[PDB]
Amino acid sequence: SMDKNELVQKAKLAEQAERYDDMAACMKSVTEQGAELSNEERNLLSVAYKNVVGARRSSWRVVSSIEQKTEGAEKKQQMAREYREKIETELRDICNDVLSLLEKFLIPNASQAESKVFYLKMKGDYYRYLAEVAAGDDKKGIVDQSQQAYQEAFEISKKEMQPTHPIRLGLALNFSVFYYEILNSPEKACSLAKTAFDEAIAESYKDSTLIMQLLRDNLTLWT
Amino acid sequence: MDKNELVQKAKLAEQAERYDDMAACMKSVTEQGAELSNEERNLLSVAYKNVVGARRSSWRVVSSIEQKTEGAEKKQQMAREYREKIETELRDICNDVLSLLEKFLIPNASQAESKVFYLKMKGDYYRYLAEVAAGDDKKGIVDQSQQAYQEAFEISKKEMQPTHPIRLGLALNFSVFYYEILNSPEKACSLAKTAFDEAIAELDTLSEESYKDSTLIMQLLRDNLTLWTS
Amino acid sequence: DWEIPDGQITVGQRIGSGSGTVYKGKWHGDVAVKMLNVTAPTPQQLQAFKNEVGVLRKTRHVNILLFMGYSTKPQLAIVTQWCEGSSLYHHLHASETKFEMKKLIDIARQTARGMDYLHAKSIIHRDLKSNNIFLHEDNTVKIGDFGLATVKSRWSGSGSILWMAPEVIRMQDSNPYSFQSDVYAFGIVLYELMTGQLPYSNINNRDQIIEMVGRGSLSPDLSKVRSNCPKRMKRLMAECLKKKRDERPSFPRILAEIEELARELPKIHRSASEPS
Amino acid sequence: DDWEIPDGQITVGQRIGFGTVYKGKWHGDVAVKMLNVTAPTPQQLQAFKNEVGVLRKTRHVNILLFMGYSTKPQLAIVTQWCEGSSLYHHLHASETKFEMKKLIDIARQTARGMDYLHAKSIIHRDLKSNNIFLHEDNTVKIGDFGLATVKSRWSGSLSGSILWMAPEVIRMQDSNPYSFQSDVYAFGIVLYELMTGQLPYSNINNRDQIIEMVGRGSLSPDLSKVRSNCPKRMKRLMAECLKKKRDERPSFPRILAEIEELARELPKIHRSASEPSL
């Protein structure tokens, strides 16, 4: 209920206060305004929703693990389960918000290829996140939509982008872990990961060093 | 609904770092009316301390931004309004905790241990309200904080040994009250050094676990004394 | 040579006890002072103090608490560099400071460097424990409290028992202490680093612990090592904790193993996606 | 055989920079200053044994810790390794932005180091920001004691680091130009570097003369280039340490006491520490 500049300022202020729910609400409003976001506005929306959903992913993993270690106790496992489904509901609502913003504003208004591959990557990542907690009857559908968006962005990635470009290095990282984790295709995931890493070593300054380190850790642990 | 189910879901919220859920669970447990156990007491304390600490940190950040923004009047207005939003959250959290203390906890505290622990918690949350209170209600809140602290301090020195972790923590928090809120370093260092030296005397007299509990606060007392005299 | 005249050291607040009592002091900056609160030292305390000064005057290493001087006039006193921070015992069991595996590895490596230096100068510490390891600026390891230390020259001069090796605890013979007893104490401190807790956690009493470790019936529970602890480190600690002195490794190769493992850096316990 | 290290124990690594300083491995990391000559000439051996003698008297947190010496392959002094560049590097080559609090702390540590040094009657005679090393940008370490000495009646025998040399040291007109005061003047210059961000006598066109004018007294550091947030006590103390005539300069106990006092009236950065959640 305020100017786009007023919402961006309140978003940055929420960012410095580490109140990611407020920043996410601000950037959601800014995107519902209809205009293309700037690189800064893009980055603020990404940080906001990624932190908001990451807290829930971390809590889900913790509570699921604790779900595993229920031995001889119905009510303990029942409590851990109901809490897991509470977290599950929050996780799904968040991802549905982010995917609705992606499909109704972000991707259609992307002028350059960079913006639209980034938004299709985020599309794949959030489908990813939903996939990890997917039940099984709708799981297949979510995985299908995940890989469709992921690969669609992938096709445009190595057609207009330099091997050093951090956005695709990240798209590659998320697609490889998609194949390894979400599905069970170690051969493909490691093939893609090593391909991207070697193409990057062949040819942002500090960003790529650490994303290649993440690639080397990934391949190191998968092999 | 059960008290034990609420305590268990509180521990599960603690493991997932969802401190708002743990706080809600412990608030229900204390609203049941029964005296809390030591574990239940510590879970409630941890929960609300994390809930309020997030807001304290965010308040500090945006307050600093508010004062250090000169030129932009609209940006400074927005930082002021967000500071007041955070302040409102802070106050509601503190009023919740002080309501839990005033309405349930203090009357059911039989032992001295419980009553110093809860009076110290009352002083702490009134102190958090003092960190953001401005002008009109400031004095009242400061007085209630100091009063609760002082009463807990008297009961600590009259029924708790200098090494008792609750008494040492009460000393630490009361000294921090003196330093940060009343802005009187001399009385804060006096209280801290007195408590630390009196505990250090008797420190050899403890068990390994009592030693871990006491040393954790004594190291903070000596860190504070090093920092206040630097 | 290193004697400090009386009056030069302004002694401040009493901070604790050592093997004497320790205070903070000012002498060309900050210093720590271990002092004996007695009017007249007995010949045994005076010989112990002279031995400790003799040992410390041979210690000159970044990971050894820097001895700076001694005094005799008011009371006997050893003065060292001041370390802002806490002992490793405090960090592990008194604040439960969440250390990353990288910093735990670095702390172990620096402790290994300190005891490599000490044993290379034929010094046995005989009381190496997590309480006698201090962190300077939460960054550097400093081995301290040489009150029970000695130099090995074929002669024996003589509550914290968790680090005591079975031979030491058994007391079969008058000279148990050796390089291997220090290595076993080191094994125990790696146990503390990799589990986060003290060994013999579930047996509560303190007296039985002695009988069980001396006999060999009880050894540290290596199943409480956390999963992100490198496998090499667990193997090395097992080697340092072996019940018979002669199968325990020496500090040069303990150091070499920690150095080699230093460089290996798996940040990834599990797989990891692109962050912010 | 007291501090000598047998040959073979030290693995010498990369050349990093007096004698060619290298990195080495000996029970961890070490720094090794080594003279690259087969047979030391009697002046080099006298200098080297003098430096070892001085270093074996230094045992302080703010002095680069001497660890031992070697003679077998070539004469060598071995110290602890300090991760991080010289204060000169941080100030004038990378322009690392230090807060005023950290600058005060750096001056305090250097003052502690030279209070210790002078309390053991050690004159460094080459104190400069290049010889001040930062240990993880957290601790100050005074180093390079090749020109240091114990003050003795028969004190036996500068190159281009002229800006830390006191005027009397430039003149060499006095019976003993090296003194506690000359070190205090070098210290004044390092505080000038700390509070200015620049080397002294920056805005000057001619270079060889500058020696002549500081020797005469025509030239003194321009204190107006000190930054505005520099405490007034610190600027006055630098002025006191840089006065043209040796006997108007203060002693390091007083420099240390005043730098210590200023740090206590500096406002606190961190907040108090209260009872943490169990």
mmCIF file of N, CA and C in Angstrom, chain C residues 178-225:
data_model
loop_
_atom_site.group_PDB
_atom_site.id
_atom_site.type_symbol
_atom_site.label_atom_id
_atom_site.label_comp_id
_atom_site.label_asym_id
_atom_site.label_seq_id
_atom_site.Cartn_x
_atom_site.Cartn_y
_atom_site.Cartn_z
ATOM 1 N N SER C 178 55.277 -40.489 30.708
ATOM 2 C CA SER C 178 56.189 -40.603 29.580
ATOM 3 C C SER C 178 55.595 -39.825 28.413
ATOM 4 N N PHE C 179 56.238 -39.930 27.252
ATOM 5 C CA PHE C 179 55.677 -39.337 26.045
ATOM 6 C C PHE C 179 54.328 -39.959 25.703
ATOM 7 N N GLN C 180 54.182 -41.269 25.925
ATOM 8 C CA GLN C 180 52.924 -41.944 25.617
ATOM 9 C C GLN C 180 51.785 -41.542 26.549
ATOM 10 N N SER C 181 52.068 -41.235 27.818
ATOM 11 C CA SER C 181 51.004 -40.721 28.679
ATOM 12 C C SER C 181 50.497 -39.373 28.177
ATOM 13 N N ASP C 182 51.406 -38.525 27.693
ATOM 14 C CA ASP C 182 50.987 -37.271 27.078
ATOM 15 C C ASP C 182 50.195 -37.532 25.802
ATOM 16 N N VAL C 183 50.627 -38.509 25.001
ATOM 17 C CA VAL C 183 49.906 -38.850 23.776
ATOM 18 C C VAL C 183 48.496 -39.329 24.101
ATOM 19 N N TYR C 184 48.335 -40.067 25.202
ATOM 20 C CA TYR C 184 47.001 -40.525 25.583
ATOM 21 C C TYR C 184 46.145 -39.360 26.066
ATOM 22 N N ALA C 185 46.741 -38.429 26.815
ATOM 23 C CA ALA C 185 46.013 -37.217 27.177
ATOM 24 C C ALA C 185 45.562 -36.471 25.925
ATOM 25 N N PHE C 186 46.438 -36.405 24.924
ATOM 26 C CA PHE C 186 46.080 -35.808 23.644
ATOM 27 C C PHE C 186 44.934 -36.570 22.985
ATOM 28 N N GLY C 187 44.974 -37.897 23.038
ATOM 29 C CA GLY C 187 43.861 -38.674 22.522
ATOM 30 C C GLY C 187 42.552 -38.295 23.185
ATOM 31 N N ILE C 188 42.588 -38.087 24.500
ATOM 32 C CA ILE C 188 41.382 -37.688 25.219
ATOM 33 C C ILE C 188 40.919 -36.299 24.784
ATOM 34 N N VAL C 189 41.851 -35.366 24.555
ATOM 35 C CA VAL C 189 41.384 -34.042 24.130
ATOM 36 C C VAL C 189 40.795 -34.105 22.714
ATOM 37 N N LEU C 190 41.327 -34.956 21.829
ATOM 38 C CA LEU C 190 40.635 -35.144 20.547
ATOM 39 C C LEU C 190 39.275 -35.798 20.730
ATOM 40 N N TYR C 191 39.141 -36.700 21.703
ATOM 41 C CA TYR C 191 37.820 -37.236 22.003
ATOM 42 C C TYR C 191 36.869 -36.091 22.325
ATOM 43 N N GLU C 192 37.316 -35.171 23.184
ATOM 44 C CA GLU C 192 36.493 -34.019 23.548
ATOM 45 C C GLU C 192 36.167 -33.163 22.329
ATOM 46 N N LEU C 193 37.143 -32.972 21.441
ATOM 47 C CA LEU C 193 36.920 -32.150 20.256
ATOM 48 C C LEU C 193 35.904 -32.780 19.311
ATOM 49 N N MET C 194 35.947 -34.103 19.150
ATOM 50 C CA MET C 194 35.114 -34.749 18.144
ATOM 51 C C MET C 194 33.754 -35.206 18.659
ATOM 52 N N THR C 195 33.590 -35.381 19.968
ATOM 53 C CA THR C 195 32.284 -35.727 20.515
ATOM 54 C C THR C 195 31.551 -34.515 21.068
ATOM 55 N N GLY C 196 32.281 -33.574 21.666
ATOM 56 C CA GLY C 196 31.695 -32.437 22.336
ATOM 57 C C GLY C 196 31.499 -32.608 23.826
ATOM 58 N N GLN C 197 31.747 -33.801 24.359
ATOM 59 C CA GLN C 197 31.505 -34.127 25.756
ATOM 60 C C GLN C 197 32.728 -34.829 26.324
ATOM 61 N N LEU C 198 32.732 -34.982 27.632
ATOM 62 C CA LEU C 198 33.786 -35.744 28.269
ATOM 63 C C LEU C 198 33.573 -37.256 28.100
ATOM 64 N N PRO C 199 34.658 -38.029 28.132
ATOM 65 C CA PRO C 199 34.572 -39.495 28.047
ATOM 66 C C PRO C 199 34.030 -40.040 29.360
ATOM 67 N N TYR C 200 33.596 -41.311 29.387
ATOM 68 C CA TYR C 200 33.062 -41.840 30.652
ATOM 69 C C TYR C 200 31.913 -40.996 31.200
ATOM 70 N N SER C 201 31.139 -40.484 30.244
ATOM 71 C CA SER C 201 29.999 -39.605 30.477
ATOM 72 C C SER C 201 28.936 -40.302 31.318
ATOM 73 N N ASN C 202 28.643 -41.574 31.034
ATOM 74 C CA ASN C 202 27.582 -42.230 31.790
ATOM 75 C C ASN C 202 28.051 -42.830 33.110
ATOM 76 N N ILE C 203 29.309 -43.218 33.290
ATOM 77 C CA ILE C 203 29.638 -43.676 34.634
ATOM 78 C C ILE C 203 29.874 -42.386 35.422
ATOM 79 N N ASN C 204 28.986 -42.118 36.384
ATOM 80 C CA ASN C 204 28.975 -40.869 37.147
ATOM 81 C C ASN C 204 30.061 -40.774 38.209
ATOM 82 N N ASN C 205 30.268 -41.846 38.974
ATOM 83 C CA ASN C 205 31.236 -41.813 40.063
ATOM 84 C C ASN C 205 32.609 -41.557 39.458
ATOM 85 N N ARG C 206 33.519 -41.105 40.310
ATOM 86 C CA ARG C 206 34.862 -40.729 39.904
ATOM 87 C C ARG C 206 35.839 -41.797 40.335
ATOM 88 N N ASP C 207 35.594 -42.453 41.460
ATOM 89 C CA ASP C 207 36.499 -43.493 41.906
ATOM 90 C C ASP C 207 36.483 -44.764 41.029
ATOM 91 N N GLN C 208 35.312 -45.257 40.574
ATOM 92 C CA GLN C 208 35.357 -46.489 39.770
ATOM 93 C C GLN C 208 36.109 -46.312 38.456
ATOM 94 N N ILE C 209 35.950 -45.148 37.823
ATOM 95 C CA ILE C 209 36.612 -44.789 36.571
ATOM 96 C C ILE C 209 38.074 -45.198 36.561
ATOM 97 N N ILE C 210 38.738 -44.961 37.694
ATOM 98 C CA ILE C 210 40.135 -45.337 37.859
ATOM 99 C C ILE C 210 40.333 -46.839 37.722
ATOM 100 N N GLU C 211 39.591 -47.630 38.497
ATOM 101 C CA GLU C 211 39.740 -49.080 38.410
ATOM 102 C C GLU C 211 39.502 -49.600 36.997
ATOM 103 N N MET C 212 38.420 -49.135 36.360
ATOM 104 C CA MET C 212 38.101 -49.605 35.011
ATOM 105 C C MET C 212 39.132 -49.217 33.959
ATOM 106 N N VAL C 213 39.620 -47.974 33.975
ATOM 107 C CA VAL C 213 40.638 -47.612 32.991
ATOM 108 C C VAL C 213 41.957 -48.322 33.271
ATOM 109 N N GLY C 214 42.324 -48.498 34.545
ATOM 110 C CA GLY C 214 43.571 -49.191 34.830
ATOM 111 C C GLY C 214 43.541 -50.635 34.367
ATOM 112 N N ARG C 215 42.444 -51.339 34.664
ATOM 113 C CA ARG C 215 42.318 -52.727 34.226
ATOM 114 C C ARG C 215 42.266 -52.851 32.709
ATOM 115 N N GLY C 216 41.536 -51.957 32.046
ATOM 116 C CA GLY C 216 41.328 -52.050 30.616
ATOM 117 C C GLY C 216 39.897 -52.393 30.265
ATOM 118 N N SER C 217 39.061 -52.643 31.277
ATOM 119 C CA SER C 217 37.650 -52.944 31.063
ATOM 120 C C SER C 217 36.920 -51.796 30.380
ATOM 121 N N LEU C 218 37.337 -50.555 30.616
ATOM 122 C CA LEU C 218 36.641 -49.398 30.075
ATOM 123 C C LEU C 218 37.597 -48.545 29.253
ATOM 124 N N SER C 219 37.117 -48.118 28.094
ATOM 125 C CA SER C 219 37.794 -47.215 27.178
ATOM 126 C C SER C 219 36.771 -46.207 26.680
ATOM 127 N N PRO C 220 37.217 -45.061 26.157
ATOM 128 C CA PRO C 220 36.261 -44.072 25.645
ATOM 129 C C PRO C 220 35.335 -44.674 24.597
ATOM 130 N N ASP C 221 34.088 -44.211 24.601
ATOM 131 C CA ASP C 221 33.087 -44.674 23.644
ATOM 132 C C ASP C 221 33.276 -43.894 22.348
ATOM 133 N N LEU C 222 33.989 -44.487 21.389
ATOM 134 C CA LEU C 222 34.227 -43.827 20.109
ATOM 135 C C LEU C 222 32.984 -43.757 19.229
ATOM 136 N N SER C 223 31.853 -44.313 19.664
ATOM 137 C CA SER C 223 30.625 -44.241 18.885
ATOM 138 C C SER C 223 29.888 -42.923 19.069
ATOM 139 N N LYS C 224 30.353 -42.062 19.972
ATOM 140 C CA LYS C 224 29.759 -40.750 20.176
ATOM 141 C C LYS C 224 30.494 -39.665 19.406
ATOM 142 N N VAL C 225 31.381 -40.046 18.491
ATOM 143 C CA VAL C 225 32.019 -39.078 17.608
ATOM 144 C C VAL C 225 30.999 -38.671 16.555
#
